[PDB]
Structure formats: C-alpha cells, structure tokens
Amino acid sequence: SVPVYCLCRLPYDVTRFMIECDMCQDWFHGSCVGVEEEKAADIDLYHCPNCEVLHGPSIMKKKPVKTGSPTFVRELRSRTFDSSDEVILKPTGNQLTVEFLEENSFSVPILVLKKDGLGMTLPSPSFTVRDVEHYVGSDKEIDVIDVTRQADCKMKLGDFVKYYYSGKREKVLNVISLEFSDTRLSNLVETPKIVRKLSWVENLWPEECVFERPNVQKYCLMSVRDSYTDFHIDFGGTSVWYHVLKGEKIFYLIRPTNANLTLFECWSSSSNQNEMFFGDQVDKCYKCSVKQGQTLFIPTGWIHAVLTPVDCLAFGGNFLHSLNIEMQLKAYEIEKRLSTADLFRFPNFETICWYVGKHILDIFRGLRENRRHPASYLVHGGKALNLAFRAWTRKEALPDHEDEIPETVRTVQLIKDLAREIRLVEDIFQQN
C-alpha cells in the first residue's frame, strides 16, 4: 500500500521539488505543473491546474535572501546569537553518566571537549573521506544535499569523493545521511557508551520480531566549507550524538518550549519558509561551536540548524530514550501534521514504543517489588506513552496502527497494568 501524488500519480521521490495545492491537499512536482523552484516563493497559496479551472488561479504574494544561498551563509556568519555557554553543560567523558542525565532529564545540550571517558571507538583524526570510500563502497548510492538549492540529490559515494578532493567546487554539496551500520566502516566505530545505555533500539529491540531493526545510530558526515542545514527536529524526536573528527561544525540551538514548537510548526508549513531565518523568531537561539575531537549531544526536541565553516568529516547518530518520552511523541505528531515522508521519520517508531512500554512496566513492577520508586521523569514519560498507546488502539484509529503492534504484546493488559503502576507512584508522590 504505497501512496502516489501529482498529476503523474507516482510514489514519492525525495529528489524532486514538490508543492501542495491548498484546494486539493495533494502534492505536485514543480516540473509537472511548470513551477520552477526559484519562482515557487512568490506563491502563497498554490492552485493546481485542475483546481484552478474549478476554483480560480493560485494566490500570489506581496529583496529576500534565499536560505542556503552564498549570501545567506555570509549573513549568517555575521549574525549575533546568544552564547550557548550560558546553557550547555560541559561534563567530562567520565562525568557523563546516566545518573548525570537524569538530574535534569537530559534537557539541555551537552558538549564534551575530549573523547576520554566517552567509551567511543573511532578511527584516528587522520582518517579521510577517501578512507570512507574504501570502507563503504565507491558504487554505493547516497543522499547528497545541494546546499544552494536546499534539495536532496542522489549519487555514487565514489562520485561525491571525486567532487570533494576536486580542485574545483562549483556546487556546495553536503553528505549527512550516510548510515554505514551495514558496511565494514561499522567495525571501526562504536557509539558513545551513554548512547548505547540509553538507546531504546539498542536495548529493547528483540532478534527478528518480524520487523527490520531500525539502524540510525551510525552516520558519516562529510561536509564541504559553507554547507548549511536548516532548522529541524531530528526524526522521531531522537537525541543526537555528534563527533567532529576533522574540521568544525556550528550549531544553532533552540529550546523546544511550547511557543517555539508552535512557531516551528508554523514555519515548517509556511510559503515563506525558505526566505526567513527561523532563528529570528525565537527569544533565544544559541550558537554552539563544535571543534575537532569534541562531541556534542543534542536533547529530544531541540530545534537546530548547522553551518559547516570549513571542510569537515564527522560521525554521529540518533537515538530514542526514556528521559523525555513526551517530547519524542510531540515530535512524532508534528511530523504527521506536516505530511512527512517516511524516509524522514524514525522507522517503526510505534513498534519500539510498544516494546518500551512493556519494559517500563517491568521496571515499575520491579521497583515496587524491591521497595523502591521510579524517578519522576519516568512516571511522566510512562504516562504520556500510555496515553499514546490508548490513542493508537481506539476502535476508530486501530486500523492505521495495528500493523506496528508487536505480536508478543497484549495492548489492553499493557495499558491497564501501566495505568495501575503509574497511578500507584502518583499516590506515593502525593504523600510528600
């Protein structure tokens, strides 16, 4: 059951520019309806050829800088931001423990200056993109971002490498989607210990289970000078570990307050999106520099953009965890409302949530049996998760969700037992 769009009735293709018709609510390829990317901006409310004859032409708007343009990057480099030093935590590798994260529910970015203590396995700083080719494969196809166009393209890793070491770059290309978990490069990399300890998939995804294991923990980032990735929330509301092996990366971090999340969603569905810097709309946009050998950890829901000031090679990944389950679910709902294609969503997000629910149940019961109670964040998360469980299993909604429910899970019993456990803890928390 694959959805199709446009006049051509084809399944989604992330390499082609698409716009939505307000009347239809269907999406159309720019080339299929004669709308070039450069002129799309002038359109506020687009009317497709059909809707046009039946309900009038498109609504036009009304110089503006285009996000990702060389002019945009220069202006960004000169913008004044808030100092991330006033909010980001700087534990040492050995101080970054689960207990440390629990103190504040891993609610703010964390920057670790030296890998020592991070339990991270990586090749030496002398590793080159050319070495990535040798380990990944010259003929492998990868998603590459044409920064000037803020569009995704597909090419052979080998082709990208040629462009990289090329004595000329007429285009600003950036590779940020190369997940190498199933290549030999995977043998030379181990994600930070803290990531593997918190990761839902790492700890709760069973062997086989009829669903393919989500692999989003090992990505290789190869970005040329001036590459720019616009503001976003990583898929599934995952947290991010980011290690700069060579070069430097600049992050623009915005806290996921209810106001900023609303502002973000409005911005993500605007007709102006590519003509406005989202950073100008929030009260605080923190600029964080991550240099060679340093590792940045981005919390759940944090909105961020990324500038590459110099050629850079980096490793990073995404992971879901239990410190802010409600925020992960919020990110998930935002993706749905924005009609996000699956390749930009956490794979089998709901399935892993069910396994987590079962696990959280055992923890609650386990803690109660050992005369102990769970941390408050777990209760809040367990509750928001149980609410989602109920929403996904309601008579009228079940058809769109049953498919992701593991066979080894009794939804009714899980939901009831979790509600019981949570409620108990809430009573005890009320004593004090």
Binding site: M18, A151, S177, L343, F344, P347
Partner: peptide, 14 residues
C-alpha cells in the same frame, strides 16, 4: 509556497 523540505537527514524510512 507550501513545499516539502528534502535537505534533511534521511533514515531510509519505510
């Protein structure tokens, strides 16, 4: 105009 953003980190999805 309302356009789908593609300059993001992909997961392969489906």
């Amino acid at each position: 105009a309302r356009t789908k953003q593609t300059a993001r980190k992909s997961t392969g999805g489906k």
